[PDB]
């Protein structure tokens, strides 16, 4: 397991809001996040 | 000495509001020396329409 | 009028209630019978918060005294201040829990929880704009560890808008007194990580060093350990109790003392804690309030504060002259010690001051302080859990009354988590 | 005929209310009861037409414990007691708590009171409201006030003095979330914002008075002298009148910004006043001197824009006019290219009415001015700094999204004053 | 209000600061309660450069009185002006370095400097500027000289630019009290020279001699000879206390005397001495007290000015007191005997005037000499020294403690510097 | 049209010219991929990719392999950014008769591409230490080939001297001596600039303590900007690069200027204050803001080029070069009446995006020289004769390839040019 970020973690939570504490375990889980081409020259 | 001995102390329990705000005297009270007098009426809308 | 209900558990609990209801019932001037012997009007202007009313001058406390076996409660009962709590709210059964968590939140505590949430419902519908509960504690034993969460969790179901308050004494560092506390209190985390809007660390460990270092006392009782717990709940209801000018309630020290919702762990602390002989010799200015109340030595948690890093502060002053040295005094420290406090949030401390003194000093100060440093209190609590769990001590008692071992890694994980969730934030 | 209604919200509010209040009370011989022991009074007090003067406001908080003191103590039979609204638990901190949910069960009783005062005046000129920002209902409540004040007023001045959230210092940790968020609701619903601080104004009490730890009371006595030097001259006689809706056709040139200043010039104790001539000229170099002004931002980081000169008491045109002059000459006042006179004098003859127990000493002139500048761009980015560095995790959010608001009003607020952030400099090139 | 901190340090610092206290106590004003009982209103503008203000009016003394025995730290808590100190001010532990300079710096005196060091900290960030700090010991123990020279070592770090003032016990001449003498006082040299400002050099023997043939007492004990030296201690700082015609303070007296950054050990002296026989008998004015002034016999140390050279030489007077005749008469005994001043400095004594005399005195004033007689007292504690560690004598209880051989060889190659340095103005 | 080409030697010169490849880009205006969102500095190929000119030379790889991965590698064309296998030890023997010689054919080769894309070269710029072995051996090299190859182009070259008490190597006392009889009759003029003295100019000044070797560094950028700043942007009283040496070096062998900034600012120190172009002149004329120890009393002053920069009238410079005459302080020399050249350009000092310098309006760059650096030179001379009395340090420059005998020969060498910054100062008779 890659631990958690718990940055955008709690960011990305409270977008839709997360309010509440029990509503948030249930968003914990199911948020799981760890030349050119061509040209001329001269 | 008045902070070195404290007040009498009947005001340990009583607000900032008690304190700061007593009824202020009769006499410390201004007279209004630059104004209209009344007893010559002002100019109202008289048209009550 | 906004009422908080008390609900003391465990002995532990009865014992922080017997303090906590005679220091409220003089800074409002109650005396034993229930009347008013007091002086002040503004005394009996806010009573409504935690105290009723009945016949005459009746002020029966509004609490719900809890326990599983009916001794601590008989103490109380038969005690100074016993005659005041009504003779219902004194919910007891029979058998114990014998400081095992299993017992209280599952067996013997889920057949009184019915009648405690009757009395809870009884002192909460009978009252108008309730501020919210309010629990005292000792996470480490099996009522207050046990049925102290199961009722924090059925309060929180019927009323979720409340303030859930919870005043509870962390498992100490060094000093150990019930050997299977490891457990109680890794079991009785997830819950209180998840139910309460204020949980506080109130460890007897820091209580007894403020009674030694600071507060030179050669014989230090619980009594004076209560009275440190005591004093830090008055505080933090002062300016709903006594006129302030810059005000502060429960909520509004929430609001701006809990920066992410998960973390909820407060390390509380006085401010005019002296000695008897050394109690003439101290000016009592704000300077001399703020050095005490931010020095990590008055800290009534065992987790130093250098040692982490504060997200947020509070400081809810008492007294009266103090509103041009309070903030002065408090960008100061803001501004010094600038390592052991966060940058994501600027201002980092809630001013409030409540212009009625404590009975005695001319004035006092309470900090609830939200360091990330809470994270050794969880942190020590696992590594003694993780160390029994694995030689399966213990288990035998706790899997039989009912508890798969999936419960106990479960908790392991919600704290360890806590922990990573709070270094993050540092 | 000339009236006014004071609204008073939040807290601050109240404390400000009661100031304002006590020193109206002995400018006009209107005693605590309400009973004078002539006319000038009806800009601020009614009458019951036998002899009750009750003061033409309205006092709203969330908190009960601050507006039951007046409700018990001096001034307890001044105020109608419909007019001292209140509700049963706070908006503690928050914007959303005062706007939304807990703000929608009194805005019906202080409108239906507003209408009561309105329909009682005939001539009304300009309501005026005293808040913070760094409140809830402060910020929250004062909010949603003004957009159903406007609604069932129209184009009527109001005339906003909030505390503006202290610079260097605090008292509160979420205030930058309430100081965002109302300024994006009351900038359309606004037509005048005087700005003031607490620590610009401790900063006055502690060096410019000899009263060294001042109060709540101090800053608040000083606050009653700026809005008694505001509404002066629409109440006594003077030689050169002022209106309130002199100030919003002198003072602001766009909508957009509407944020002047203040600066109090006399504010000298009363063993230091009695050792110094307080001319005219004397007085009006106090309020163009930095550490006077009452926003702590320096007047030559920006560029003054208008400036309107209020005078009272034994002050003449002659006096006035070679003071002004003066302040033009010097090259640390900068005026901008597009402002030649930047200038409104007004003269009221009335001298500031002292009161038993303050900070000041009997004076016969005085100066309030109310001075827009460009300097105030830096108390934006500097409020701003502290915000969307703070906003950059979400910090505090999660008190205000989901109990009655979104994230994008989070992403509107600080783009609205990204463009005010873009709006100061467009005034300075 | 420029704020000077008073420390003390074991026996010898804490029996000075009892019979210091009481000489201001009792010319401030100050009762045994700390309540000011003054009779005057020039006592108490200036209580701030001692006496800390405390509620009811106790004026608490700002002094850390340490000692790392439980013993004399207690002499002063029970006594006539002990009720005093902040009854925290005084960190006292059980032990005792034992008239050892090793465990008294090293071992257990350094368990101790955290508790004084949160006590100093604690006291003197409460004012509102430090002028200084200020302390007295005993160069012959193991813990006025052990854990004194760790404490200024310490104190002096995290405050630079703050002046220091030391009142040294240096060992006597002909009778000493301990045989292990020249070993704590020869390493406590070098750790005062570089962390010290200005050092003064007490001397018991020298002492006796006044309170027998100057004051004629067949008794003189330590409570009539440490008035003397909380005389002169109270004698120093008084423009810091009191005003005056011509007003110094603790650095006016600084710049004048001390000429280079090693060479700050001085002649402390008291002028008004005479016996109570002379009671009524005696003028006390000028020429009868700047002629007592410069007398090897009025010294406070074994050192005779006759046989070195003085570098700079200083006083404060007191009193209402014309001074004509303190610059007449003090550039004659800077002219009369020019063989003693040095001539490369044209004028060698300063002049600094306060206006309230102690309480019992009318006029009276201080002395204060940089003096290439300083040399003999180093070198006799250098010949005493060095006669001992060539054998490898008690050196056991100086290495088996965690201390080093090569600090010992150090310590008197510093001090054989400092006596060349003293030897280079000799003519 | 007028071109300069750059060549950046030793860790010193690289890491100098990293500050003025930054300090120039943001002046001419090109992101650092060389892009713009010829130039006497820069070239430019057709696309757009303005290039840089400069060839940034170090045996040690290090160094110059950061400046071909950092933010500024799309610039400096691989070609011009010439490494090294290793072999880079403090030994002008190993810089000038070992690990040089297999590099001073590319180097040299690059210096006549870029002398073919130029058209009129007003002369050269070479970055230097003056103690280490690179810098004290392949910069001889460059200087002993330069001669011959570009025969005579004004080869103007910037110096870090060896510090007066706070230097690193033990060995900076002999390099020094022997990079002189060499760098003595190649270089038309060598602007030393110490780091000892630059270090307390941001402590006294600048009050930044801590200074570390980025700051250092920016200072000679914005001194270097100076003394090439009347090549690029427009001004009146312009200079060029071949007047400098006809209006500073007094005789042949006296070719060693000093260096001094004027408005040394911090960013917090400009609350509305512009040090006059009558402040900056008295200012770098002071003992103190020289930015190599050497106090200019203990030695006349022979020349002066008081260059300044952005808002200058073309008369307060006439009021101040004459004020600084009176002073009996500065005494100029006999044989130099004038001795006060000037320069204005128009171009105000510009601002590294992050440094600790502030928008000032006016700078003067004084490259004036003292018969004040003997005490320099006697200096390194004492600090030699120790070392060389017990032949210290000397097995390793004899192995690399070199006689026991150059020392000496150096030695006479620097012995001569302390008595002729002798002789030129004995006044006339
Ligand atoms: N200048 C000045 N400001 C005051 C005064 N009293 C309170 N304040 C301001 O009030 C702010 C804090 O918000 P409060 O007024 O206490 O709270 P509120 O506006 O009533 O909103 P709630 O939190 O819901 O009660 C502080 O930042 C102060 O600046 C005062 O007397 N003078
Ligand atoms: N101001 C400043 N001086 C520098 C810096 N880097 C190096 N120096 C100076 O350069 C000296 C050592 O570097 P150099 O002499 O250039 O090293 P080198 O020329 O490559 O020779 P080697 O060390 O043998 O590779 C030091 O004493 C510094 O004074 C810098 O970034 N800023
Ligand atoms: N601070 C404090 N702690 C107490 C007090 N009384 C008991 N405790 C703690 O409470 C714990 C015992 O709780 P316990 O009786 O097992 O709870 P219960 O069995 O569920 O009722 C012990 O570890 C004590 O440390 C007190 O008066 N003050
Ligand atoms: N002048 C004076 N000297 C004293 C007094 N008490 C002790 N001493 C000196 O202190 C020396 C002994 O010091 P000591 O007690 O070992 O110091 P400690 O290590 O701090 O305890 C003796 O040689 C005395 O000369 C006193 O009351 N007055
Ligand atoms: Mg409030
Ligand atoms: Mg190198």
Redesign the pocket.
């Known amino acids: 397991e890659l631990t958690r970020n718990y940055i955008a973690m709690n960011r990305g939570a409270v977008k839709a809001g997360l309010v509440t504490a029990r509503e948030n375990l249930h968003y914990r889980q199911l948020n799981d996040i760890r030349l050119p081409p061509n040209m001329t020259f001269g | 000495k008045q902070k070195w001995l404290p007040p009498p102390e009947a005001t340990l329990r009583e607000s900032i509001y008690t304190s700061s705000y007593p009824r202020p005297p009769a006499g410390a009270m201004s007279r209004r020396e630059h104004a209209i007098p009344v007893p010559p009426p002002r100019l109202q809308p008289v048209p009550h329409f | 009028m906004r009422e908080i209900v008390h609900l003391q558990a465990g002995q532990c609990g009865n014992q922080i209630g017997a303090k906590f209801w005679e220091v409220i019932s003089d800074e409002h001037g109650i005396d034993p019978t229930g009347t008013y012997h007091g002086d002040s009007d503004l005394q009996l202007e806010r009573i409504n918060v935690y105290y009723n009313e009945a016949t005459g001058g009746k002020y029966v406390p509004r609490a719900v005294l809890v326990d599983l076996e009916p001794g601590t409660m008989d103490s109380v009962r038969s005690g100074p201040f016993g005659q005041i709590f009504r003779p219902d709210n004194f919910v007891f059964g029979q058998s114990g829990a014998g400081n095992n968590w299993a017992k209280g939140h599952y067996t013997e505590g889920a057949e009184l929880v019915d009648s405690v949430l009757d009395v809870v419902r009884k002192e909460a519908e009978s009252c108008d704009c309730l501020q919210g509960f309010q629990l005292t504690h000792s996470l480490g034993g099996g009522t207050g560890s046990g049925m102290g969460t199961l009722l924090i969790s059925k309060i929180r179901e019927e009323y979720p808008d409340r303030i859930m308050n919870t005043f509870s004494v962390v498992p100490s560092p060094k000093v150990s007194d019930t050997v299977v506390e490891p457990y109680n209190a890794t079991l009785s985390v997830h819950q209180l990580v998840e139910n309460t809007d204020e949980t506080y660390c109130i460890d007897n460990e820091a209580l007894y060093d403020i009674c030694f270092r600071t507060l030179k006392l050669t014989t230090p009782t619980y009594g004076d350990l209560n009275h440190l717990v005591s004093a830090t709940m008055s505080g933090v209801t002062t300016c709903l109790r006594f006129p302030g000018?810059?005000?502060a309630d429960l909520r509004?020290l929430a609001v701006n003392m809990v920066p992410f919702p998960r973390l909820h762990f407060f390390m509380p602390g006085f401010a005019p804690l002296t000695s008897r002989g050394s109690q003439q010799y101290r000016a009592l200015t704000v300077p001399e309030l703020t050095q005490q109340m931010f020095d990590a030595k008055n800290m009534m948690a065992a987790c130093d504060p250098r040692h982490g890093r504060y997200l947020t502060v509070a400081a809810v002053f008492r007294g009266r002259m103090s509103?041009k040295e309070v903030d002065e005094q408090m960008l100061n420290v803001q501004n010094k010690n600038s390592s052991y406090f966060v940058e994501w949030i600027p201002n980092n401390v809630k001013t409030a001051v409540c212009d009625i003194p404590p009975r005695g000093l001319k004035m006092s100060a309470t900090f609830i302080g939200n360091s990330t440093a809470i994270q050794e209190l969880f942190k020590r609590i696992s590594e003694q859990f993780t160390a029994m769990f694995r030689r399966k001590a213990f288990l035998h008692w706790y899997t039989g009354e009912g508890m798969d071992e999936m419960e106990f890694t479960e908790a392991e994980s919600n704290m360890n988590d806590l922990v990573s969730e709070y270094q993050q934030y540092q | 005929m000339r009236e006014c209604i004071s609204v008073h919200?939040?807290?601050?509010?109240?404390?400000?209310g009661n100031?304002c209040w006590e020193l109206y009370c002995l400018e006009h011989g209107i005693q605590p009861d309400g009973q004078m022991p002539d006319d000038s009074f009806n800009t601020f007090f009614s009458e019951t037409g036998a002899g009750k003067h009750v003061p033409r406001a309205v006092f709203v908080?969330?908190?009960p414990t601050?507006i039951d003191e007046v409700r018990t103590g001096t001034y307890r039979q001044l105020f109608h007691p419909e007019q001292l609204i209140t509700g049963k638990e706070?908006?503690?901190?928050?914007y959303a708590?005062?706007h939304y949910t807990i703000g929608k069960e009194l805005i019906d009783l202080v409108l239906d009171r507003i209408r009561k005062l309105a329909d009682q005046c005939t001539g009304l000129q300009g309501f005026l409201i005293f808040?913070?920002?760094?409140?809830?209902?402060?910020?929250?409540?004062?909010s949603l006030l003004m957009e159903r004040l406007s609604v069932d007023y129209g184009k009527k001045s109001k005339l906003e003095f909030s505390?503006?959230?202290?610079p260097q210092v605090?008292?509160?940790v979420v205030?930058p979330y309430?100081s965002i968020l109302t300024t994006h609701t009351t900038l359309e619903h606004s037509d005048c914002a005087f700005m003031?601080?607490?620590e610009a104004?401790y900063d006055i009490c502690r060096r410019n008075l000899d009263i060294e730890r001042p109060?709540?009371?101090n800053?608040?006595r000083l606050?009653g002298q700026i809005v008694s030097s505001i509404t002066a001259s629409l109440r006594f006689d003077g030689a050169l009148n002022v209106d309130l809706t002199e100030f919003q056709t002198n003072l602001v040139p766009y909508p957009r910004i509407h944020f002047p200043l203040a600066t109090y010039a006399p504010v000298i104790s009363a063993e230091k006043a009695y050792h110094e001539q307080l001319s005219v000229a004397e007085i009006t170099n106090a309020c163009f001197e930095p550490a006077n002004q009452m926003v702590k931002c320096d007047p030559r980081h920006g560029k003054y824009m208008a400036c309107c000169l209020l005078y009272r008491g034994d002050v003449v045109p002659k006096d006035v006019n070679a003071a002004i002059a003066t302040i033009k000459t010097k090259r640390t006042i900068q005026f901008v290219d597009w402002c030649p006179t930047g200038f409104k004098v007004g003269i009221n003859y009335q001298p500031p009415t002292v009161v038993p127990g303050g900070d000041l000493a009997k004076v016969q002139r005085a100066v309030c001015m109310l001075s827009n500048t460009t300097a105030i761009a830096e108390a934006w980015a500097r409020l701003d700094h502290k915000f969307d560095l703070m906003y950059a995790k979400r910090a505090f959010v999660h008190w205000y999204v989901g109990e009655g608001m979104e994230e994008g009003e989070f992403s509107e607020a600080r783009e609205d004053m990204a463009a005010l952030e873009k709006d100061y400099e467009e005034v300075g090139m």
């Open positions: 000018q810059l005000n509004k509103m | 919200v939040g807290q601050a509010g109240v404390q400000i100031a908080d969330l908190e601050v706070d908006a503690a901190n928050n708590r005062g808040h913070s920002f760094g409140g809830g209902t402060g910020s929250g409540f004062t505390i503006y959230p202290a605090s008292t509160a205030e309430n003031v601080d607490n104004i109060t709540y009371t800053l608040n606050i």
